[model samples]
Structure formats: C-alpha cells, structure tokens
Target: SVSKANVPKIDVSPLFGDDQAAKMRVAQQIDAASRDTGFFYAVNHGINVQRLSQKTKEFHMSITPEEKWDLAIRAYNKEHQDQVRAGYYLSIPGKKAVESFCYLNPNFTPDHPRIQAKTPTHEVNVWPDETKHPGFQDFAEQYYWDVFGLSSALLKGYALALGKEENFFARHFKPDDTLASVVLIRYPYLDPYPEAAIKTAADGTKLSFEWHEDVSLITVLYQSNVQNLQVETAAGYQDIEADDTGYLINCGSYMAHLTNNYYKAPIHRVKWVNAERQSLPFFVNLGYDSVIDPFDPREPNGKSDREPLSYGDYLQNGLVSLINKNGQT
Candidate 1:
C-alpha cells in the first residue's frame, strides 16, 4: 500500500540571493515540476515557521470588524455534540467544511495610494487587539511580507519558465496594488461521518475538505504537518507528505488561464485525520489591475482570440461567486 507522487524539491535559495545561472536552474526545475505534477516542494524558501506557529497561536479571535471580508465556520454534514466556541455549524453543497479567514495584504496602510484611492481589492484587514492577543497583528504583518517576498521571488522563476524575461511578471505584480491574500484555515476534528449523509464526488473523493483549485497566480501553502494532502495525477490520487522544512507550492487557475493552459492548475484536497489541523495558504495574486488574456503558449508571440480583462474584476467576481448572499447554510 505505498503510493505517493514524486513531487520535486525546488531549491529556491538562488532566488533570495543573486546568481543568474542558479536562478535559471531553479526556474527550469520548477517548470518541469509544474508541468508534470503541478506541485513542488519549495525547500530553502526561508519563512521562519517558528514565528509562524507562534503567530497562529496568538491570533485567538477577531476583536470585531464589519469591514473584514468573510468568516464561515460550518459543519453541517457532521453532528456529535462537538461544542467549540470559536467554531460554528454551517455547510454548503460544494464548499469546504472548515473555519476559514481570508485577508488582503496587511502591509497596505491608510496612507498608501491605493488605500487613498479606495480600491476595492485593496481591502483592509481585521486584527485582534494587542491587549487580547498581544503580537498577533504584528505577526500577521510579518508573515504577509515574508510570504510576499517569496512569491515575488518565485514569480521570477515562473517568468523564466514561461519563455520570457525575468521581469515579465514585474508589471503584473506591483506590491502596492497587489491583492495577494493570506488564508488562515483550520479543519475541526470530526467523528466519522454517517454513510447516509456522505457521498463521494463524481470523481470519487470523500474527504474533510472537498477538491478545489486556487485562483491566484501561485499558491504557497504551509499546512500542518500531516500526510493528509492528496492530488489527482495520471496514476490517480496520491498523497503528498507535508514537511515543515519545505513548503508546498502549486500553480493556480489564473496562472493557467494566462498561459493558455501552458501549465497546470492543481486539483487537490485535504483528508481528515480525526484531529484539528491548521493551514496557512498564501495566495500570490497578480496586481488588481493587471490585464489577463489567454495568449497561446504554442504561439508565444501574442496570438489570442479572447478579450483581455482586469485581474481585479476577474478575481473579485470569482471570489464573490463562491459565497452565497445569505452565507453558507
């Protein structure tokens, strides 16, 4: 009973330092892994997880903010007197059954230009009080920058892989106008589900979190240490071991869309382990105003039959569509 995908380990150290040859090597390796497994282990990416866990622990509660995006704590498919204050009970037909919090770039201040302009995607974040949770907000800001830096570095590799210059993604990835999001997600412990209430998807997946794809250019995920992440490949669904030393990197639908399916977007999901788990998935989004058009990868000279749309519009609409007007039931 041995089955796991051979997810490549991409040495991203070159990105943090200056070495053209080394960066190129990393890019090609990343491209290969992205083309094949659609996932890779970005080791040496450098994100100080010790502090990351500390921050997660300190982020106990959202003090209260009507401006914060969305918070859905649901478990409609399960029932067994699992009483937890922070967690709630609600679920939808095709959404994840977990406590999730999504936030925009925390570095943007009220004085920033985009903030001054009142950009929709340049949304503000809700933070717990310094008195109640101490350094949670500080940690969040620190975490956002750390992951943001890595995403920018990785974008270079992605650019080089896509048969373009190192700065091809520069215009599309402006820091001030970026909508790069951080999602702090936790799946609660659940008793085994009843057969009457559980049913596999058409593709045969029955798990704590259903199968899904990210909408960012790339999603850098730091999940709890578990063998619970699985992705479907040519061979079939295979588990990808989660290691603290390395980060799980996957391409997103936006990436695929822009490249005209030149690369792959991962179809992945989480499996329950009868215990609670935490995952911090940093979605590195393109600039909110970046143009998106599916140019032909086969004909890399800008041959496209589709109208270009703003990344913000596409991203906002898609994100808005995921939640119901009345919230998950």
Candidate 2:
C-alpha cells in the first residue's frame, strides 16, 4: 500500500513567487516521487469544488444515448471552419454504440477515418434540454470552464517546475485552439459483473481499462463517493479514495516530455467490477502548435528551440496509441 507521505501535496504559490528556490523544490519532489510513485495528487491549485460537483452530477444525468451519437457525428465532420468542434462519446454497459464510419487515422482529418475536431470552437457540445435534464447546461458549462482554467494553470506550473519562466508555456497555450472533451461515466454498484460490455485485461486479469498513461498534459478526475481509483507506488496498487471533497490530479505523456523525464507519467485504469464508480474525466490538452519537448529559453536576441506542434498531431498520436492498445486511451 502507498503511504500518504509518498504522495505529498506540493503547493505552487511559493514557486510562482520566487523563481530559483521554487525550481529546486520542484526538482526534489519530482526526483523523489518519479522514481517511487509515477504520480501524485495536487492540492491548493485554483479550482472551484462546489461548481465542479454540481456540474459533474448534471453531466451524468443530462445527455441521452441518441444525443451523444449526434455530437459524435458533428465531431467527425470533415468540412468546417465555423464552430469549435471536439469529440464526444457515451459508452453504456451492455450495447456498444455503433458508429457507421470505420475507424480512421487521427493524423489528418480532411477525410481521416477516426479524426475528431481539434478545437472547442469547432464543435459545440450538446446537453439535454432543461426540460429533459434540468440545470444540466449551466453545470456543464461551469464545470468545463473550471477544468480548462485548471489545465492552463497546470501548464504554467509545469514550466515553473522545470526551471523555466512561468509564462514560458502559456505563450503557446491557445486556450481556444486545443481540442478537449469531457466524458461522463457511471459504473453502478452491481454484483456479478455484466459480461456484455465488460472486458478483460492484458494479463488475463479482469481488466477495466488496462494500465496506461494519458497523452494529454494532465487529466483532472472528479468522482462521487466511490472507491474504485488506484495508483501504483513503491508498495503496490493502492486505492484512491473518492470522498465528497476528493479530487485527483494525474499526469500524462506530454507532461513527461515537458518535464524531461523529471516526473513519471501515470499508468492508470478503472476498476469496473463493482458499480458505484461514477466519475468525470477532464481531458486537458494543449492547443495546436504547442510542442511537447523541452523548451529552449529565449535568447538575448529573442529566439529559442521550442518547435511548433499542432493539436492535430498530438491528438492523432494519442489516438494511434489507444487503438493499437485495444481501446486504451
């Protein structure tokens, strides 16, 4: 079991206040935990909990199966310069939702098979009308905003943690340029797991989502009083208790690259055996053109080695990994 001290809550305010000393603190924390535990929960970061709870509950109850399908189609649209479009999905327990189009490469989306939009402005997420799901849109909107803000803050923190200027990463942060989505999932408490949609693990163990790391920079997870989350540490896979006031901060491959291996990417999954596993996963990503490598500092002549990367490239790479790993994104 992982000890509480193993996943210490390192604050960011002090680091933001002073540059040099803050960098040292971050390096020490990462070096210690990265080699022992691949990840840790961040606290004291700016995020609204009351709003997150309200929105999370609304999202799980709002969208219907049919509406989810419609949103998916819009996300897969080829010709678009109009609205900010991103992907959406609803994977209920038994029946697998049928998507008429074959899985396409996420690399190029002009006519790509599995490509989703690369910006929130490109696609509009649809929530059930208030008549159907009262107070759903308000919460969803607020929830997404809160998460996006947190995402931006984390990107800056990563830069600070790596001995770089605070806004070193923000210049590339295209708040409206990146594609992000929110998946509302509910795993009800049930004995004798359902075999229809339930899957197995790579080691022939009853697998929920096999161990994997995220392709995005960070994944902010919120749950409703469930005990299904777990993390691997020096000890073993221990539970991530979900209380009313609980939330989780997880890192991904992009973060790994940015930190130059200073921090370990989290290999995580969902335990689907018992129901009562209701949570919202905030898939936070950088805007198109944000490179995932070490950023070279600005020279006196005003230049650096940060390469321009597209959101499409990041999304595509992430998609390929997930599909190849048998739906493990």
Candidate 3:
C-alpha cells in the first residue's frame, strides 16, 4: 500500500558546520521527521555512495556463493547475539532474501588493550582472502569510517533537536571502541520463484523481506538505485528509493529508546524485485561502554527511571528479537 509520501530528503551537511541557527533549522526538521516517519533521505552526507555501491557490486561479482559458505561458517564462531547457532547464510538464519558480509568496527584488533578491557564487540572481521576478494576489505574498512563520521554528525543534529548541546549525544560514540557494524548485501533476482517465497499481506502487497526494525542507534543505508525498499508509517506504507548520491537514513529501535519515546523506530522492509540489487547499511552504535539511559526532556530532570544499562547489553538483547528461535520472528 504505497499510498503516501512522508520521508523527506534532508541535506545534513549543515550539521557539521558552525552556524547555530542553520543547525537548529535542520535539527528541527530532523525532530519532526523522527517523531513522524522515522526515516529520511540524507543528501550532502559527504559519502561517495555511488562509488562505494559500485565497489560493492564488484565485490559481490568477484566472490562465488560457494566460497561464501566457508566464510560464513568461519565467521559464525564469533558470537553474534542470535542464540541460534544455525548456519547463517542470510545474516539472520532462516528466511531473508539477501546474502551479506558483516564486519564489526575494524579500527581495532583482539590484541588492542581496550578489547581486553571490560569491553566491546571486539572480534576481528573475517574478511575473504586478499588474493580472492582484492578490493572488498579495503572498501569495507573505509566504508566503516565514512559512515562513522556521518552518523556522528547526525547524532549531533538529533541532540540539537532535543534542545541539548550538539555534542551531548554524539560524544558517547567514541572512535576507539565503537561497536558499529556495516553490512554489504546483495539481493538476488527472485522472479524465478513461482510460489512459497512471496507473501501477500491484507493489503495484498508482496514482500521479499517483511516488516522489520533495526536495533542500531541509526542505520545509514545506501542502496544501488533500487526501488524495492518501503517503510510503514502511521499514514501507510510508502515506497522509498535512494538515488546514487544520497542515503535512506532510519533510526533503529535503540534510537527510539534513547530519545525516550520522542522519536520512532522505522519499520521497513524490502520487496521482491525481478532484477538484482545491492545495499550497504552501517549500523551505528554507541560505544560499548556507553550508558543507555533514555533522555526525556519532559521529565523534571529530563531522564528515565530504568536502571543504567550498557550499550553492549542492550544490543545483545535487541538482536534476540531477530533470531529464529525455532521459526519465530
């Protein structure tokens, strides 16, 4: 039911500049969008998504699916939050329509002292061989930092929107031990499936991946000119497409909770397409040791009653919602 349009394309470059009034203008826009659609098209985000997306296509083409099997198994040894130990060819276990390469923050290693500290999601990326997948590791590594900086700036805007200092929220995300992770995924052309793959809703819309919300503080997604993405808002389902230069930014569940119900977490999914598509999503996280207290301006002191929780603990718990606990959602 693509019956409405709500997500607006926001030029987020002002978030990085020094103009206070300009910052408030954009932050107010973000505040309005966050409270309503929970999604936006971020242009002037300062990333070469077109160039990076092209490299993702090249990286996908270079690897055979057969080779991905071993990589998936090897990476599975590192504990992702899903309690299910099933073979994860689809990022999640059972029935997603894409294959992805997920790499945690590549800025540090297992030997890094912070990793040994009371610590973060510090496992190293199980990248495919340099000889085999030449440019992917390089591309993915750079992609992590690019999204990191942009997401940091976006956080500053969110803070300003909340009537707080710009750095008040962004300061929690440290470069040294961020748990942010990025995924490069390719959705295959599924027209070949005649039945059992697609499901029609009450409104009769077909879905490849049904409605779901991310757990990231924010997920910055850059797609390869695909129209299959959609978001569900109070108004209705609206089609979302990101052009080559910009991204579709969505706040995940963590963000909704952080804002103390001031913002909504976008419920979004992909549709089945006859043609192949690729997407890059960087799930920005607060540094692992950062506190997860929700900021509530309405409160007398602008805070919540929940006991202080760490970002690491909250993220682990949120991922359980996505696991296939014996075919459950």
Candidate 4:
C-alpha cells in the first residue's frame, strides 16, 4: 500500500534551454531517474493547465453511449472480434466521473487483425451529439492539436535522452497524419478504494484493476484530485497525490526498447473505487507501417534483439499477446 512517504514529488525543468549548467542538471535527473524509476514530474516543462482542463471537459462530453454507434466507429471491422458482450456505454450507472472511448486505427488494414490491430479489446467508441454540446467539437480539435504539438516536443526530448540526435525521431513521426489514435478518459472521483484490491483482474471480487502495462512510447495522464491513482514500484503499488501539477508521466514498452532495456516501463492499472476518479490518458504508439526496434549501435544492422527476433517480429508477437489477453478474438 502507498502512503504519503511514497509520494515523492520531482520537478524536471533543468533539462531544457541553452544554459549548459541547467541542461546538465536536467540531463542528470532525466537519465538517472529514467534509468531507475522511468517516471517523473515537470513543473517548468510548459504544459498549459487551462488548455488541459478545457480539453478534458470537451473530451468528457464527446464520448457517450449515444455517440458510440453513430460517429465514432462508423462501421465495424468484422475481421477483428469484439471483446465486451455488450456495446459501449457508461462503465458506471450514473456517474460521469469515468468514461471510455475506442478507435479503429487507419494505420492497419482490415486483413491485419492477427498481427496489427489497434487495441487489445478493439471495443468500439461512443460519441455524444455535438449539437447538444457545442463546445465539444472545437475544444476537441484544439485539444488534439495541442497534444500533437506536445508529442513533437516529447519525441525530441526522448531521442536526445536516448543518446540520439534530436531529429532522429522526426523520421518515425513523419506523415503524422496517421490513424494510430488515442483514448481520452475522465474518471472524477470523491472517495478512494481499498489499497489491497485496486490492481487485480476485473472479476468483481475486490475492485482491482486488470494488471497491464501500455505498449506505447509514453502515456501522458491527467488525474483529478482523488486518491485512487497508483503505480507499481519496487516497494509495492503506491498511490498518487493529486496536487496542482502539470501532468503525470508513465513510461511505456516502446521506450523500454528504445533505450535498449535500460529503462523499464512501470506496470500500472486502475481499479473500481469507493471514491470518485477522473483521468485523461494519451496512448502514443508507432505510426502505422513504421518498423520499431531496439537501439543498439553495436548491432545496428543485425536482427532485432527482442528475445530472439526482429522489430517487426516482436511487434507481431506483441499484437498477438494483446489480442489473446484483451481482444475478443
């Protein structure tokens, strides 16, 4: 169980600017912390709080049961199977604190289900009427653009952090107009959950979240002022303190490989709680058809070192694992 002691707060402003000293400090923190914790906070990193909140409100209203059938998943990808027996709806009865959405990535074609589906579940999305919520469309558009900008900055930072040129990642991100999408969730809460039962399978026994780690490069999450957020640490699963902060950072599997396994992606999960919860999560994956592999200068031209395969081979295996674990097929 996590307590106030485990809630260590860190600021990552020293990694930016032309100042050599400041850059050194920032680099040290990012390198060491990333090597150890693979997670940290930013104060002077320059993420707009007002803009974040504005996007939150818009995204919250945009996903609903009514909207899921019409606008979100215009048509079903029949080749891929559906997970949930029922269609998309409020996970909760009446509370709007927690809402979920889905995307059919245009990155992969219909025949690529076995190797390159978007998500493990592949559940469809639900959208709310824009006419009812006039602010949703504009706000969502602006919010998406803002996130795209931030993602660009992050790509450079990560590349440099990995001992690569700043422009190294630009190639992977080029033609950014792909369908590798994101899920913007809102889980506003008032009460917390039992410490022992928040990260288990969703069997409805003790309200544990399904054990899982995201497969993206990095996931930027924003949580409301509730005590339900937690991450797997060496000590154990620790709860997060929701103070006024820019955003919470969590490493992903892609990052783990990019650093040649020097960095470890924290295993994280959410559970049903007795309190209210709110969170906005951004899942950033490799662009479609873009091959990803570990960065080992020694074996640059060699086959992938992911266990015993190539980048494409590992990704294909990873896709199978996702589908077998979370997808309907």
Ten-residue stretch with the least lDDT total in model 1: 80-89
TM-score of candidate 3 against the unseen true structure: 0.87
RMSD for each of the candidates: 6.2, 7.0, 3.6, 6.4
1-329: candidate 4 lDDT, tens digit per residue: 34431333445444445564554455456566566556665455566756666665565655556555433332232322442311232344342334455443332334455324544433332334667766654555555455555555555556666666655554566423232345555554435433433334533333334446666667666666665555666676555557545566666776677656666777765646665445655555555455555655346553446642233344446656764774321
Question: TM-score: which candidate is best?
Answer: 3
* TM-score, structure 2 vs. true: 0.70
Judged by whole-model lDDT over C-alpha atoms, candidate 3 comes out at 0.73
Per-residue lDDT of model 1, residues 1-329, tens digit only: 42697798888989777898899999999889888879998988878976786567445234333212122222332331221111223323234445555567655677877778876666556554468667766777778888888888888898888777887775587666788887776554555533333335555556665566666788898877766788878777788887866788998878877777778788876655555667888887777678855676578476767667688877776555544322331
Ranked by lDDT, the better of candidates 3 and 4 is 3
lDDT of 2 by residue, 1-329 (tens): 23332455556444334576664675456445554565555566566666665655555555566655554543343332332234344354453221211111122344422236433223444444577766765666666666666656655666655566666666665544555556565555544445654566553445455667876676766666755555655565555555544346667777665554456676766555555555666767655556655543223433334454555576667756775785522
Weakest 10 consecutive residues, lDDT, candidate 3?
Answer: 79-88
lDDT of each: 0.69, 0.54, 0.73, 0.51
Per-candidate TM-score against the hidden true structure: 0.81, 0.70, 0.87, 0.69
Model 1's TM-score against the true structure:
0.81
lDDT of 3 by residue, 1-329 (tens): 36654778898999989988998999988888887778888888888777787888887777766566655633343443421222224433234446667777776666767555724345656667788877778887887888889989998988898888898778888877787877777777664554455666556788767688887888888887768878887777888755757777878887777676677788877777756888778888877668856777667788766466678777777766565321232
